[PDB]
Every structure is written in C-alpha cells, then in structure tokens.
Amino acid sequence: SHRKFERPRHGSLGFLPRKRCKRLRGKIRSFPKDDKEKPPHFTAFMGYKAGMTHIVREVDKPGSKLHKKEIVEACTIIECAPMVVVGIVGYRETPKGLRILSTVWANHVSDEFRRRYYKNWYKSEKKAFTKSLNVPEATKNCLLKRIEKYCTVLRAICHTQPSKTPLRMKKAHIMEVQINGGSMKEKLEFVKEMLEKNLPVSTVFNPNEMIDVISVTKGHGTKGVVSRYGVKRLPRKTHRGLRKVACIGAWHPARVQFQIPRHGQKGYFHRTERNKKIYRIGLKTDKNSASTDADITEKKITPMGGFPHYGVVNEDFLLLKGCVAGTKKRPITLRKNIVPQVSRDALAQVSLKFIDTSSKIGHGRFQTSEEKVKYYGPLK
Amino acid sequence: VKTEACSFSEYRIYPGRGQKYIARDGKVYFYLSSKFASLALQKKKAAKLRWTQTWRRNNKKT
Amino acid sequence: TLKNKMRITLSLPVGALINCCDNSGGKNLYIIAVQGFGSCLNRLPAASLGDMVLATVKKGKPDLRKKVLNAIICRQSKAWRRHEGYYIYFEDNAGVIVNPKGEMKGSAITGPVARECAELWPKLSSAASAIV
RNA sequence: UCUGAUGGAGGAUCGAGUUGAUACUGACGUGCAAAUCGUUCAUUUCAAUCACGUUUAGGGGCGAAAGACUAAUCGAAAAG
RNA sequence: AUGAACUAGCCCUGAAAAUGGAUGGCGCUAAAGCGGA
RNA sequence: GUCAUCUAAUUAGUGACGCGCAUGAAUGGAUUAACGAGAUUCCCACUGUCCCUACUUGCUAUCUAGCGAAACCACAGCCA
RNA sequence: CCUUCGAUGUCGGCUCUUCCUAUCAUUGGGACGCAGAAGUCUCAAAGUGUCGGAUUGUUCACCCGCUAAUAGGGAACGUGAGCUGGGUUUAGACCGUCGUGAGACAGGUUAGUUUUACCCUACUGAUGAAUUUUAUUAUAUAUAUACAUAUAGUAUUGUGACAGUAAUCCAACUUGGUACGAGAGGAUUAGUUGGUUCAGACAAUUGGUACAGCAAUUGGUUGACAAACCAGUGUUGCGAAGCUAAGUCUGUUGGAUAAUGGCUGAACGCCUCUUAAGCCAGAAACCAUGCUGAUUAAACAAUACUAUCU
RNA sequence: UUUGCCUCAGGGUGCUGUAAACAUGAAAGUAAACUUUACGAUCUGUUGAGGCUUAUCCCUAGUGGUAAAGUGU
C-alpha cells in the first residue's frame, strides 16, 4: 500500500554512480558554445586550491535589507601560475562524434611537461618528445593547413607549471582549452602566435566575471548510508544497529532497485559547479595583492603563517567568491560560462574594502607579523 | 580598516572574526575568540588572568 | 511593510518556553507553531528573531491563559550571524504578544530588541526602548 | 501535664557480602554457557542464609499453590 | 438535383491502475488489417 | 456515555451522574495511614528520546602468518 | 475453497524506494448563474510537493495548528533473518456474565524468550585481464584505394554510443488602492528583495568534537623538592589540526508538442481551426542542452617513445 | 627518488598560561632569644615565562641520509 506520509527521496540520482573519479584532474564535459563574432579567446584555465579567507565588501543592492552596509564573504584562493601553451588539436564533426584530425606540437616542451608521460621519470632516460620535435616547418604548416581546411573545433594543449607552486608533484597537468571565437583561420593564427609562450590568468578571465569550476571533491572512503545519503537514523532500540535503511525495497520486484541508498564510496567525486564570481585577480608582480583602497597596507594574499596544508602563494591567483570542491593542493579547472550571464549579480562590479590575512591556524588576531611584533614588543 | 576592541581582552577585532554577547541589561560585549567568550561567560575577571592586558597594566608591566 | 527578513539561524522549535518581555500580563510564551512553516516530514517548526509564532501563555493573567495567541520573537539565545561579520546572541529567549496583524497587545517592551525584529515590525520598534 | 538526657525495642530503614532476578524486552543467541555476560534492580535480625546428615518414591511423594518440583525428563519420573 | 428521415459496414467517442510490455515479437497502411473469391 | 476539570487540541487521567448488557456485602461491600523491582495520569527537575545529527575511545570487523568449523544443498541461480 | 497445514512469520507504526491517476496544490487552457475579488465545472498534464501535534495499539476517526496543498491509491493488506511488540494470539492472575462442575466468553484487565546469512542472485561501492572472421563515417600529393587498412607495449590527451539526471514552491513590496465596481472591496502580468523544501559541495568565520598539547586538582605511591606514575580516558578548564551543521557557497536555455485558440480553405454557391488537403501560436509534460558514469561500446581516436626489427 | 625527498634543527604561525631555581623578598598569624632566628596555604621578581606546535601546518642549496637491485615485456 501507499506511504503514510510522503517525503522526497534521499539524495540525487543525477550524480550516480557515486564511485571514485577516474582521474584527479577536473575534466570539462563540454566547452561553452562557440560564437563566431567574438575574437578568438581561451575558455578554460587550471589552478590549485590554496585555501580560503574572508573579505569585506560594500553591497549595492537597492531594496535589499543590506544595501549600503559592508558584509563579510568567504572566498577561495586559487593559485594560478601561468600555463604554457604547447600544442594544437583540431576536431572535425562526424556522425560518430568529434574526430581528431591531428595534433601538432611546439618546437620545445618543458621537462615538466614531459614528466607527465612517465611513471618513473627519475630512472628513465627521458626520451619522450625528443625526435618528433625536429619535424620540418613544411609538414607542420601542411598539417596546420589541413586543420584549417577541415576542422571545426580548435583546442590548445596547455600545461601547468607545478614548480612555481609549493606542490611536491613535479609532472605538469595537461589539458586542452577550446579556442572559442572567430573563424577557423583566425583561431589557428591566434593559437599559433602564442604556441610556446606563457598563458596568464589575466588573458583568460577578468575581474567580476562569473565562471564555473570543475574539480574532484574531497575523498572520504566508504561511508555509511546515513552520512552518504542523509537517511534518517533508526530508533535507539534497533536490534542489529540503527545506522541503516530499514526497508530496501518492496517484495516485488524481487530485486533491489538502483534507487535505494546503500553504503559505499563518499567523496572523491567529479563536480562541475556553476557561477563562482571572481572577486580579484591578484598578480605575482605586485606587493599589495591583498591590499584594498580602504586598507592601503602593504600585504600579500598568503595569510600570516602560510596557507595551512598548502604553502605560500607566490604566483598569480584569483579570489573566488564562495567555496570550491576539493582539498588543498587540488587541481581546479576554471571554465567560462556555457552562455554569458547577464544577471545583476553576474554584471555587478565588486568593490572590496578588506582582505583578511590573519593566521588561519588557530584564531589569529594580526594581519601581519610586523603588526604582531609591534604589539608584543621585545621578548626574551 | 576600522577594527573594534575586545571586551574581555583588549585585542583588536578585525572584521568578520569575533562574536557579540548582549546582557540582560542590554549592554553589548565583543569577544575576539571562543576562549575569551568562554572565560567571560564563566564570569572570570580578566584582572586575575596573568596573560591579559588588564593584568599587565594592573601590575604596571606594559 | 517589507518582509525580506534575511535568513536567521533557527532557534526555538515548537515546545519552547520563552519570556514575554512586555507588559501584557503574560510571564512566558509556549511556542505552538511558527507562521509560514511548510512541510517537512519530521522537522519541528522553529522560529527566528523576526518570526511570528503561535503561542499560549503558561504564566500570567487568566484572561491571557488557555488560549491560542500570536507572538513575535524579540530576543534569541542562539547565536546568529549578521552579515557585518560577527555573531551575536542574548541570554533569554523572549517575544511579545501581538495581534494577528502584528500590533502589540501590551504597551511597552521590557528589555532590548534585536534590530532584525525592529525593522520588520515598526510599531513594535516604536514600543521598544533599546534596540540592539 | 511538659522539657532534657539516658536506654536500646522492632518479622524498623539505608547498604556491601550472601541470597535472588526488576529493566534494558542490552549483549549473546553456529553462545564462554542446552540460561551465560554487563549495567540496573530486590534482599541483609529474621517466616533469614549455608553445609553435612536424615526422612517422604511414581497414580506415589512434596507443594506460603505455579500443575510447581521429584537428577537438562513431569497435566503422571526414569529403566527394562 | 436538390432537402430530409431511416438503415448498416468499417472508423471515431464513450474506454481510468498501479515494476517496463506485449495482435507471440518485429513490424505492417498500393497491408503483412477487415469481408470475400 | 453525559457534565466538569486537566491541554492549543484528550478514544487517556481525575471528579461527578446512574433504569447498572452483566455492581453489591466473609464469592465479602465500602474505606483506608504505612508499605510495593505491582498497574495508571499529570507536574517540576533533567536530559541526544527527538528537531538532526556530528565528533571521539576501547573491542571486533579489515589485510597478513598460523589454525580452522557448521547450518544448508534435486539441479541451479538476470529480467518483462 | 483452486494453491500452501514434513509451516509462505499473522495488526499497526517507524524506515525506504518505486509505481498509478480517478489531479489536492503548482503550469498552461476552456465554461460559468464570470464586473472585480473569491469561487465552481472542466481539459492537457504525474515534472515537483503533499506537514507539526493532543487522545487512541490502532487502520479509520476527531480536534489543535502551519500550509500552496495538507489528493486518492498499488507494490504478497509493499516492507518482522529491517526494527519495535502497544494490540491480537499459549501457559500466571483478576472482574462481570454463563455453567452443578471441569470450564466458556468478537466481554474487560495485568504480566508475558521476536532465532540464523559466511551461500546464489539483486543492489552498493572496489580490483581486473582477455577480446581477428574482429573493426573501419578513411587513408594516400584538383588527383587512387575495401582486391584496402589494422603489430604490440608503456603513457598522455581526447571522442562519447548508451544509461542516469534536478530543482521546487511561497511571501512581501512596486505596478496600484490601479483596472473593475454604485460602493464594499480589489486584481492579472511583469519587476525587486527575500524565504521554504530539495540537491551538490565547502570550513574563511561561529558552534560541536578530543586517547595532539598545555594547565589545574582529589585519593594513593616513590623519604622530601623536582619528576612522575596508578584510578579500564581519575576529574576538571582551555583546546590547535582534522572532521563536522545548526554554519557558508552554488543550483541553465533550446527544440518539438499536448490542451486550447487561430490562419487559409473546400466538402456543402454560404459557412467552416481540418469533424479534408495545407499552415500558426502554444504547458511544471516530452526530447535535447547542461551535469554524472561510461570493463554501461567485451568501443574508439590523435600523440610521445620503444621491442633486433622490416 | 639528488636544485627532489626523508630526517632533525633553526625560523614562522599558533595552543596553553607565567616553568624549574633563587631572593636580611611578601604573607593571616604563630614561638624563641637577648632589636634577630624558625614555621607558613598563598603571592611577587627574574617570567607574555616554560612546555608543545604535523604526525595530514608553513619556510630554509641549514644537519645527516637517500638503501640490494629483484621481476615482466
């Protein structure tokens, strides 16, 4: 018979199977739809999760109970050292999907890039990408002309530079960033110009821009159905334990349905979250990356004492409004929105007044070590 | 940046950090951390706590 | 007349005994229901600062007892975050008795009143002495 | 008649031990165990508890009575 | 060549149930359906 | 059952009413202080019983070396 | 009385999922005895949601209240090797009535052991080879070739068939005291700010947590101080880190349609949305988009380097 | 897997809350000598001290180390 009382099901069936992700790197399922009018541009980037802080900003929402007050917002810091563009891939449309015509490489690729091709780079003799980089410019241009002739989707292979980060991992993270923009010829030329140089975050994104983040959630091993699906605990009197689903199906069908919550892996899932706004693109060069016009204090983003479990952000970075899936040191893919957003929130110009850099270990009371020593005075 | 002052300790509270407690009489207190809130809620006087700025000033030590 | 309360941490579920903090005659309010609470299977209806609740009086004037009457929370002991960046809380839970329309049954409010409640209910703010 | 001591009665009270077994309808339930384990609980000057000895034997015994018990066997034991 | 009223073939409405589903299945309409020869 | 009371709300509780299916006097009637691991309703205190779960400790589980059963079994083991 | 009496665990609730539509609300329509507001009848529609409590073992009921709504049902009266055991339904016992009696009682009451999964499958997660009578949406300098091409190892970047899929509802204010109305009242739609329920994350802050760590302290013990130690974590404050919600962040737009309203337009000189041909607009539905998986395709591509090799 | 990493140390950042020792130092008071000597919970100074801080905190071309090369193709 029917349920006495209705209530919605536990968890979403759209994120099944809740199995471990194939890879650690976030992977774009689909790039934003190409608009032929816009000039050619990159659509994606990759950084590493450094940590989180909070900022103070002035709201500009008329009719909102906040409006003219200064509110505190949680922000995630993503260390975005420039990538290197190393290759070009052309895709053509076939009834069986996208088919690669060819991928052409740059003349020089870093050992950081070549490391990704090895499980034991240290004891190998690093012969990868050694004799295929001496191809003549004639055949390179032939392949490029064929790509321009027949391909409809252009992507640029680019790789991160983990040496610029505090990461222990040395092999770079490689992906392909789809070039959205003008004609095929314009895309080809756009990527050919910067076929070997650095790609900073500033070229890909702008401040106050809404983006999407693709990354693998924090892992938790096997978790019970209570913590994995949110099912209700059984009463205290339950004979064989209470942390389980009581009925895992009706008598018929004489099977367990795939919609029934069970124990299993929790976390380490691939998630693509939409609409994280960029609050600031901090530059490696400047000494006041964490300063504001209402702060005028000379300070950088890294909190007093380092980013816990991460290190120090010595490179370009971006300050993302809100939270982002993954642990510290996790590679995080940033993607342009599938269609440009025109909402008030997406179009707003954030003007932050203060960026916190107190210690995130313990309860820090100082923004700078100079301030701490000034307050305490001389010691033993 | 305009910081406030703790009521138990004298430490400066930067924005987005502390917590407020307003008493039965309606007068407000600001506490930097859960520790200071804990002591103030057990009604420990900061004057008798050796590490506090109140104690330091009271023993002419600053 | 503007009901954009902005979410406040839910304290005071159904069955809470709070003070009256007004001169209506009642001494405490026993929360019976929370206005606007929808449907959720085992969820207890719970109230926040500006919320209107249904309550009965368990101590006070007999003409106030043994009846269902409206109340508005004014002081909440559960710490809640206001967007300036800090957390705040009172010690007692307290609400005043009001007409369904929202106007106070009494004439004065004893202790402080949260600013969130005050801007939601103007005549209650006018009756209030200290707004915090 | 009242007040203070003294005195040390009672199938008096609390409570370890002993003797039991209220609840968790806990554990265990292919047990450590054909009745145990943990916590909780009842009981302790008396109709109290224990030992050994001794008497009552099967349509019989014995029963502060549940058809209880009478060698893991009882609305008629066990053996042939 | 007009207007009616009947008649009876096929078709349609009347025709709502619980796992996903059954002219046996695919499918079939210049039938691979219906009534004949 | 009806009327009160208890609650915001009472097939519960208590107090009354009594043409009582089918109450009633050692088949004992009515009432009772004290007593109860007896049944029941309410109140204060209290709390993870619950809103609504989270974190944590031991012993298992888990992997390993060693040791090593049993129940069950026509044949077997995807569905409409 | 067909199947089960060499046993299919017999009420309810709790938990959890799925399904139906005879739709309660939400979407978009048609009618009205339809001015407005509210409402009633009715269509397409099952995407989303259908609550907190008092009494009762209860289903049902009936009240209190919130709600947008508190619709009705199925799945062995879904669900007892999932629980619970209040009821029913053994043995103790009490009452009433019946019986000479032993005893009976859809009459009431009280107390009364809830066993087993390590097997197969299903489901949930986790490793993983092998795959030629196999595969190909090409490969070759405006030009041939299936009479062809394809080794294998590592490794990266991809393709993405197919399967799953997700958001939902509300309030306040403005439009507006406007349209409408004799007044009384009083919208729709759009916009703004919020919020519920749900989903996916996260820990800057707040809170929780403690067999990191410091400190205090009771009893005991080492002659004392110091250092400790024992008390199944001795007990207390605070308590980083890490987990964590009660805390924080995020949650699209296209196509093609249904109902319905229409266009042109015969049949049928007129008329007719077509109950012919030919068209249009159109819904929380549908299919995509987006998201998750893809040893779900025993799938495949491009690349890098190489194995005496050819 | 040798501009790496592990280790310990130094530094940072925090947590706790001022270590041991010493003082013709204080201390409610007490007792014992012909104005000093003993006992004393506790307090003070040196002392925001001391301890701890990655084991899943941060920095350092700081110390020491970085091991046999076994299997498959």
Coordinates of C-alpha atoms in Angstrom, one line a residue, chain A residues 6-347:
Chain A
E6 CA 5.3 11.5 1.7
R7 CA 8.8 13.0 1.7
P8 CA 11.3 13.5 -1.1
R9 CA 13.9 10.9 -1.8
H10 CA 17.3 10.9 -0.2
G11 CA 20.0 12.4 -2.5
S12 CA 20.0 13.0 -6.2
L13 CA 20.0 10.2 -8.8
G14 CA 21.7 12.6 -11.2
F15 CA 25.1 12.0 -9.6
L16 CA 25.2 8.3 -9.9
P17 CA 27.1 6.1 -9.6
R18 CA 28.7 7.6 -6.5
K19 CA 32.0 5.9 -7.5
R20 CA 35.6 7.3 -7.3
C21 CA 36.5 9.6 -10.1
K22 CA 38.8 8.2 -12.9
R23 CA 41.3 11.0 -12.5
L24 CA 42.4 13.6 -10.0
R25 CA 42.2 16.4 -12.6
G26 CA 38.9 18.1 -13.3
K27 CA 37.7 17.4 -16.9
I28 CA 35.5 19.7 -18.9
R29 CA 32.5 17.7 -20.1
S30 CA 31.6 20.4 -22.6
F31 CA 33.0 23.7 -23.5
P32 CA 30.9 26.9 -24.0
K33 CA 29.2 27.1 -27.3
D34 CA 31.3 28.9 -29.9
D35 CA 30.2 32.3 -31.0
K36 CA 31.8 33.3 -34.4
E37 CA 31.5 37.0 -33.6
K38 CA 33.8 37.3 -30.6
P39 CA 37.6 37.5 -31.3
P40 CA 39.4 34.2 -30.6
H41 CA 39.9 33.6 -26.9
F42 CA 40.7 30.9 -24.4
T43 CA 37.9 29.3 -22.5
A44 CA 39.5 27.5 -19.6
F45 CA 42.3 27.5 -17.1
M46 CA 43.7 25.4 -14.3
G47 CA 44.9 26.4 -10.9
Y48 CA 45.5 24.8 -7.5
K49 CA 43.4 25.3 -4.3
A50 CA 45.4 27.2 -1.8
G51 CA 42.8 27.8 0.9
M52 CA 40.1 30.3 1.9
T53 CA 39.9 33.7 3.6
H54 CA 37.2 36.2 4.0
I55 CA 36.7 39.7 2.6
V56 CA 34.7 42.8 3.4
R57 CA 32.7 44.4 0.5
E58 CA 30.1 47.1 0.1
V59 CA 26.7 45.9 -1.2
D60 CA 24.9 47.7 -4.0
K61 CA 21.5 46.0 -4.0
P62 CA 18.7 48.6 -3.9
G63 CA 15.8 47.4 -1.9
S64 CA 17.9 44.7 -0.1
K65 CA 18.0 44.7 3.6
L66 CA 21.8 45.0 3.3
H67 CA 22.2 47.5 0.5
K68 CA 24.6 50.1 1.9
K69 CA 26.4 48.0 4.5
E70 CA 29.7 46.3 4.5
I71 CA 29.3 42.5 4.6
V72 CA 31.8 39.7 5.1
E73 CA 32.1 37.0 2.4
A74 CA 34.0 33.7 2.3
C75 CA 36.5 33.4 -0.6
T76 CA 38.6 30.7 -2.0
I77 CA 42.2 31.4 -3.2
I78 CA 43.2 29.6 -6.4
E79 CA 46.9 29.9 -7.1
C80 CA 47.1 30.3 -10.9
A81 CA 50.6 30.3 -12.1
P82 CA 50.7 30.8 -15.9
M83 CA 50.4 27.8 -18.1
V84 CA 52.5 27.0 -21.2
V85 CA 50.7 26.5 -24.5
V86 CA 52.5 23.5 -26.1
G87 CA 50.1 22.1 -28.7
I88 CA 47.2 22.4 -31.1
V89 CA 44.4 19.8 -31.7
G90 CA 41.8 20.1 -34.4
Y91 CA 38.5 18.3 -34.3
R92 CA 36.0 17.7 -37.1
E93 CA 32.4 16.8 -36.8
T94 CA 31.4 13.3 -37.8
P95 CA 28.1 11.3 -37.2
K96 CA 30.2 9.3 -34.6
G97 CA 31.2 12.5 -32.7
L98 CA 34.2 14.7 -32.7
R99 CA 37.2 13.1 -34.5
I100 CA 40.7 14.4 -34.1
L101 CA 42.3 15.3 -37.4
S102 CA 45.8 15.8 -35.9
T103 CA 47.6 17.4 -33.1
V104 CA 50.7 19.5 -33.8
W105 CA 53.3 20.4 -31.1
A106 CA 55.5 23.3 -30.3
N107 CA 59.2 23.2 -31.0
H108 CA 60.2 23.0 -27.4
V109 CA 58.4 21.4 -24.4
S110 CA 59.4 21.6 -20.8
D111 CA 60.7 18.7 -18.8
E112 CA 57.7 19.5 -16.5
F113 CA 55.5 18.6 -19.5
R114 CA 57.5 15.5 -20.5
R115 CA 57.3 14.2 -16.9
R116 CA 53.5 13.6 -17.3
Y117 CA 54.3 10.9 -19.8
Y118 CA 56.4 8.8 -17.3
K119 CA 55.6 6.8 -14.2
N120 CA 59.3 6.6 -13.4
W121 CA 60.9 9.7 -14.9
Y122 CA 63.8 9.6 -12.5
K123 CA 65.2 6.3 -13.7
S124 CA 64.2 6.6 -17.3
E125 CA 66.3 8.5 -19.8
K126 CA 63.6 10.9 -20.8
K127 CA 63.5 10.1 -24.5
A128 CA 59.9 11.3 -24.8
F129 CA 59.3 14.2 -27.2
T130 CA 63.0 14.1 -28.4
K131 CA 62.9 13.1 -32.1
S132 CA 59.4 14.2 -33.0
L133 CA 60.2 17.9 -32.3
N134 CA 62.6 18.1 -35.3
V135 CA 59.8 17.9 -37.9
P136 CA 60.2 20.4 -40.7
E137 CA 58.2 23.5 -40.9
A138 CA 56.8 22.4 -44.3
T139 CA 55.0 19.4 -42.8
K140 CA 54.0 21.4 -39.7
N141 CA 52.3 24.0 -42.0
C142 CA 50.8 21.3 -44.1
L143 CA 49.1 19.8 -41.0
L144 CA 48.0 23.3 -39.9
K145 CA 46.5 24.0 -43.3
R146 CA 44.6 20.7 -43.2
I147 CA 43.3 21.6 -39.7
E148 CA 42.2 25.0 -41.0
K149 CA 40.5 23.4 -44.0
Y150 CA 38.6 20.5 -42.4
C151 CA 38.4 21.0 -38.7
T152 CA 35.6 22.9 -37.0
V153 CA 36.7 22.9 -33.3
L154 CA 40.2 24.1 -32.3
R155 CA 41.7 23.3 -28.9
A156 CA 45.1 24.4 -27.5
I157 CA 47.0 21.9 -25.4
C158 CA 48.5 23.7 -22.4
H159 CA 50.1 22.6 -19.2
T160 CA 50.5 24.0 -15.7
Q161 CA 53.9 24.7 -14.1
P162 CA 53.9 22.9 -10.7
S163 CA 57.4 24.0 -9.9
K164 CA 56.1 27.6 -9.4
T165 CA 53.8 26.2 -6.7
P166 CA 54.7 24.6 -3.4
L167 CA 53.4 21.2 -4.7
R168 CA 55.6 18.1 -4.3
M169 CA 54.3 16.8 -7.6
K170 CA 56.6 17.7 -10.5
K171 CA 54.9 16.4 -13.5
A172 CA 52.7 19.1 -15.1
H173 CA 48.9 18.8 -15.5
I174 CA 48.0 18.9 -19.2
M175 CA 44.7 19.7 -20.7
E176 CA 43.2 21.2 -23.9
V177 CA 41.4 24.6 -23.7
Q178 CA 38.9 25.0 -26.5
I179 CA 39.5 28.2 -28.6
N180 CA 36.2 29.9 -29.0
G181 CA 35.9 32.9 -31.2
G182 CA 36.3 33.9 -34.8
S183 CA 36.8 31.8 -37.9
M184 CA 38.9 28.7 -38.1
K185 CA 41.8 30.6 -39.7
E186 CA 41.6 33.3 -37.0
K187 CA 41.7 30.6 -34.3
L188 CA 44.6 28.9 -36.0
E189 CA 46.6 32.2 -36.1
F190 CA 45.6 33.2 -32.6
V191 CA 47.0 30.0 -31.1
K192 CA 50.0 29.9 -33.5
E193 CA 51.2 33.3 -32.2
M194 CA 51.2 32.0 -28.6
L195 CA 52.2 28.5 -29.5
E196 CA 55.1 28.5 -26.9
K197 CA 54.6 31.4 -24.5
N198 CA 53.0 31.6 -21.1
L199 CA 49.2 32.0 -20.7
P200 CA 48.4 34.0 -17.6
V201 CA 45.0 34.0 -15.9
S202 CA 44.6 37.7 -16.9
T203 CA 44.3 36.8 -20.5
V204 CA 41.6 34.1 -19.9
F205 CA 39.5 35.8 -17.3
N206 CA 38.5 39.2 -16.0
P207 CA 37.6 40.5 -12.5
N208 CA 33.9 40.5 -11.6
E209 CA 33.3 37.6 -14.0
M210 CA 31.1 34.6 -13.3
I211 CA 32.9 31.3 -14.1
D212 CA 32.4 27.6 -13.5
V213 CA 34.7 25.3 -11.5
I214 CA 35.4 21.7 -12.3
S215 CA 37.2 19.6 -9.7
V216 CA 37.2 16.4 -7.7
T217 CA 35.6 16.5 -4.3
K218 CA 37.3 15.7 -1.1
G219 CA 37.5 12.0 -0.5
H220 CA 36.1 10.1 2.5
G221 CA 36.5 6.4 1.7
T222 CA 33.5 4.2 2.3
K223 CA 30.7 5.9 4.3
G224 CA 27.5 4.6 5.7
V225 CA 24.2 5.2 4.2
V226 CA 23.4 7.8 6.9
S227 CA 26.4 10.0 6.0
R228 CA 26.4 9.2 2.3
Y229 CA 22.7 9.7 1.5
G230 CA 21.3 11.5 4.6
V231 CA 18.9 8.8 5.5
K232 CA 17.3 9.0 9.0
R233 CA 18.8 7.1 11.9
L234 CA 16.7 4.3 13.2
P235 CA 15.4 4.5 16.8
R236 CA 17.8 3.6 19.6
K237 CA 16.1 0.3 20.3
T238 CA 17.0 -1.2 16.9
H239 CA 18.4 -4.7 17.4
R240 CA 21.2 -5.0 14.8
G241 CA 22.2 -1.3 14.7
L242 CA 20.5 1.9 13.7
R243 CA 22.7 3.4 11.0
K244 CA 21.0 1.9 8.0
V245 CA 18.0 1.9 5.7
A246 CA 15.2 -0.3 7.2
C247 CA 13.4 -1.4 4.0
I248 CA 15.5 -1.7 0.9
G249 CA 12.5 -2.4 -1.3
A250 CA 9.1 -3.9 -1.6
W251 CA 8.7 -7.6 -2.1
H252 CA 8.1 -7.0 -5.7
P253 CA 10.1 -6.5 -7.9
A254 CA 12.1 -9.4 -6.3
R255 CA 15.2 -7.3 -6.6
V256 CA 16.9 -4.3 -5.0
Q257 CA 16.4 -1.2 -7.1
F258 CA 19.3 1.0 -8.0
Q259 CA 17.5 4.0 -6.4
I260 CA 17.9 2.5 -2.9
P261 CA 20.7 4.2 -0.9
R262 CA 23.5 1.9 0.2
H263 CA 26.9 2.1 1.8
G264 CA 29.8 2.9 -0.4
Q265 CA 32.4 5.4 -1.5
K266 CA 31.7 9.0 -0.5
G267 CA 33.6 11.9 -1.9
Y268 CA 36.4 12.0 -4.5
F269 CA 33.6 12.8 -7.0
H270 CA 33.8 14.9 -10.1
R271 CA 31.7 18.0 -9.7
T272 CA 31.1 21.0 -12.0
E273 CA 29.7 23.9 -10.0
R274 CA 28.4 27.0 -11.8
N275 CA 28.6 30.7 -11.1
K276 CA 31.6 31.4 -8.8
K277 CA 32.3 35.1 -9.2
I278 CA 35.9 36.3 -9.5
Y279 CA 36.5 38.9 -6.8
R280 CA 40.1 39.8 -7.6
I281 CA 42.9 38.6 -9.9
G282 CA 46.0 39.1 -7.8
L283 CA 49.3 39.5 -9.6
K284 CA 52.6 37.9 -8.7
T285 CA 54.5 41.1 -9.5
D286 CA 52.7 43.5 -7.1
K287 CA 53.5 43.7 -3.4
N288 CA 49.9 44.7 -2.4
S289 CA 47.9 41.9 -3.9
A290 CA 45.8 41.6 -0.7
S291 CA 45.5 45.4 -0.2
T292 CA 42.4 47.4 -0.9
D293 CA 41.7 51.1 -1.4
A294 CA 40.4 51.2 2.2
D295 CA 43.4 49.3 3.6
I296 CA 46.5 50.9 2.0
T297 CA 48.5 48.3 3.9
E298 CA 51.4 46.6 2.0
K299 CA 50.5 42.9 2.2
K300 CA 50.1 39.9 0.0
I301 CA 47.4 37.2 -0.1
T302 CA 49.2 34.5 1.9
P303 CA 47.8 34.5 5.4
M304 CA 50.2 35.2 8.3
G305 CA 51.9 31.8 8.8
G306 CA 51.3 30.3 5.3
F307 CA 48.2 28.7 3.8
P308 CA 47.5 25.7 6.0
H309 CA 48.4 22.4 4.4
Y310 CA 49.3 24.2 1.2
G311 CA 52.2 26.7 1.4
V312 CA 52.7 30.2 0.2
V313 CA 51.0 31.7 -2.9
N314 CA 54.0 33.2 -4.8
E315 CA 52.3 33.5 -8.2
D316 CA 49.2 34.9 -9.8
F317 CA 46.0 33.9 -8.1
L318 CA 42.3 34.6 -8.2
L319 CA 39.9 35.2 -5.3
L320 CA 36.7 33.3 -5.9
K321 CA 33.5 34.2 -4.2
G322 CA 32.3 31.2 -2.2
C323 CA 33.7 27.6 -1.9
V324 CA 35.1 25.2 -4.4
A325 CA 35.1 21.4 -4.4
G326 CA 38.3 19.6 -3.5
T327 CA 41.0 19.6 -0.8
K328 CA 44.0 21.9 -0.6
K329 CA 46.6 21.4 -3.4
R330 CA 43.8 20.1 -5.6
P331 CA 44.0 20.9 -9.3
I332 CA 40.9 23.0 -10.2
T333 CA 39.7 23.8 -13.7
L334 CA 38.1 27.1 -14.3
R335 CA 35.8 27.4 -17.3
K336 CA 34.0 30.3 -18.9
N337 CA 30.2 30.1 -18.5
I338 CA 28.4 28.0 -21.1
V339 CA 26.4 31.1 -22.1
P340 CA 27.4 34.6 -20.9
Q341 CA 25.5 35.6 -17.8
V342 CA 23.6 38.9 -17.9
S343 CA 22.1 38.9 -14.4
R344 CA 22.6 41.7 -12.0
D345 CA 24.8 39.6 -9.8
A346 CA 27.0 38.5 -12.8
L347 CA 27.2 42.0 -14.0

